[PDB]
Write a protein that binds this ligand. Sequence first.
Ligand SMILES: [Cl-]
Ligand SMILES: [Mg+2]
Ligand SMILES: [Mg+2]
Ligand SMILES: [Mg+2]
Ligand SMILES: [Mg+2]
Ligand SMILES: [Mg+2]
Lengths: 422, 422
Amino acid sequence: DVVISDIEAREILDSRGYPTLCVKVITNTGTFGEACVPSGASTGIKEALELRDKDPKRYQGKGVLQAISNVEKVLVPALQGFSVFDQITADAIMIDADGTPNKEKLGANAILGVSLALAKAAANTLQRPLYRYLGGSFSHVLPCPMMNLINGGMHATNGLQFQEFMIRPISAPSLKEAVRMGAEVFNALKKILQNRQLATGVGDEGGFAPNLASNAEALDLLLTAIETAGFTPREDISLALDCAASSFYNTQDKTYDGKSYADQVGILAELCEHYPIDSIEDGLAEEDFEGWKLLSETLGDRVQLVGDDLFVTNSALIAEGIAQGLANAVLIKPNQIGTLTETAEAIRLATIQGYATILSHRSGETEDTTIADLAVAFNTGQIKTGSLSRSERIAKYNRLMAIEEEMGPEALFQDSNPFSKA
Amino acid sequence: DVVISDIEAREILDSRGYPTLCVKVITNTGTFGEACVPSGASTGIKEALELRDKDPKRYQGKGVLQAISNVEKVLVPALQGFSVFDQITADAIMIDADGTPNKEKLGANAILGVSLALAKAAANTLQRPLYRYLGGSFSHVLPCPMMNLINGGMHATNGLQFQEFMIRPISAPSLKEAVRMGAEVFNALKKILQNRQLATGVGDEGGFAPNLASNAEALDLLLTAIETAGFTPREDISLALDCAASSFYNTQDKTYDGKSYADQVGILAELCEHYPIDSIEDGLAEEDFEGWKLLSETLGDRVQLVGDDLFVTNSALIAEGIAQGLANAVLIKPNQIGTLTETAEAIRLATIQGYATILSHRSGETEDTTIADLAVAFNTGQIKTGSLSRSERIAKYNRLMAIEEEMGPEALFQDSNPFSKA
Ligand SMILES: [Cl-]
Ligand SMILES: [Mg+2]
Ligand SMILES: [Mg+2]
Ligand SMILES: [Mg+2]
Ligand SMILES: [Mg+2]
Ligand SMILES: [Mg+2]
């Protein structure tokens, strides 16, 4: 039997230049797996706790030496000798060792580092693909990506209200071709921006961050780039939004930059009337029940409505929201909950209720590509992992292309958005 | 007797969203190594040929299917059965198979992909660190980085004349501390720019790309960021430039945006008098003999003078330039010449003449981290691998920190710039 022998953890930087951890789980046979932990910027209030050192003289308080210490001093003795293959058991051990609902004692970043690295150690021990180890023999669906080509909100300093302006290459016959379509639209957009004397520096997720007059102008630019690249909007490539509305929600006044939730739903409904948008993420704030209810009644039968901060990849919140008729899709961010076991259960509970799930990066990413394998492992049919620049995004597309090529005739590229324009 | 059994190649995207290759060399025992190939923007005219497909309907003609085909159909038969450890032999076989000085038949990108992946396959077969396999048992010097925090030239569309404005954290006692210092300055600079209503979108190498009035303004901003992070300019952190002067050299009349080579040397001398610059790369254009001679006579005993396009990692040009008294350091970019064997010889010929060498990324990078191992393998003492955002840069810093920790008490962090401000 192959068991956990040691766990190493080290401080690296993420794609924004902030500390995070890389964790390596080592077995008694010398096999190992290694994973790094991402970090959000527009973090939901109910996300599991990312533990930072708060040393003001070191990385402006953002070190993760304490989380690393917790891996080495607490999680190692708790996990040594347990089977590398008993993923659920190990995740339960770490949850119990922390003992708090939001993983505040040890840190969700410490625990997730181990959780991801453990699964890789087990797959590497078997010499099997991670997506097959995690998802079984019938993991075979490549996800349709939503690609964030213009960045705003907390991912830039351009004053753009919405956070993410995305394209979805829904007519692609393969993931490899979806990547090409997105890359050709992205670089057509760069030239369009340059000719308009607009900035081509990229924001945190690799999309351009120009100063624009409105959310609509960003959607206009995406349409122009789609057509300039030779594709047909709606037919070949549709549009998607992450408003990340909690970022501009005044909880005291209950206003979205001055707008009531009714006004904000009307704004979103108008955008869907005029643009080929087939998905809207976090259109209302994380705890605005009346707003989400009205959004779901208004658009929930015609557009994908993605809860991100609404659900924070949390099985209990997902069940609660589904029971209340809120949204129809769930963004899946493993570090919002802190273990792969809880990530899998969030996917399972949403899926059996007819909700789509979308594996997602964070705005602070690493060279880790685990979410590519996760999207295929669970046959989710959708992924959100960034623009077509910056290799903390590109590496996931490269990994998806490798998975697709490896599977050969087993692979199926298929969008799971039932409201797709195709 | 472990020999080459197969070579796979696949098309991925680089950090700019353009195609490149990743190559996997497989031995008869099943061990393997994999490497990806970077791509420059401000490419010297004497660089070995990057082979592109030129199909206008696919990635705007930038596919690398032909280079991949050359790996699979030409380099596989030429290399099958040769020892995985005979690196010089394999590189010579590939050079002979192409048969042209600049690797124009098969592509320097096809050849380098194999060259890098082969060395990794050999190191992986021995279960030894790549830097020890390549450099031997006394590879132990960690490089002082020069970190490109404000991007201009061909790496941005901001109209900034010089290409790279860098800091060097010369008071760091370790590479991991150099990384911290750079990250703290970078994120201080982000707030400074935002408070000045300047853009914080990043250029190709992860440095900010605001619209500035002059090269001097970018240097002023670096100084302000160093001071704002609580570091002392000159003592803790010095400055460096890559002018990439070929990018603004008019070959019709041999001037630098209108200035003579003597004017341009005078401009650089004045910058060195007013700013704590201890290194200037490609201050004159790649074939400007009189300019480089005057620069070397004027500043060559006071500041590091780095030839990049001047030498294109080419042993014969390095020997000739040294014989002419030009520059005092060489930038080392493996894909400018196309094999590791020729990369190592470029380093050797420069080093024995007292020139420093600096391992370098390209502006189009990947998740590959080979240049981190190369900088340590050859004890170069200096590396140039980007700003503190975008993980195609950060991954090299992470790899260097891993190497440093792995070596324990063997590690020595040491700047090889003999003109350093400290
Ligand atoms: Cl600006
Ligand atoms: Mg968010
Ligand atoms: Mg979101
Ligand atoms: Mg260049
Ligand atoms: Mg060129
Ligand atoms: Mg250069």
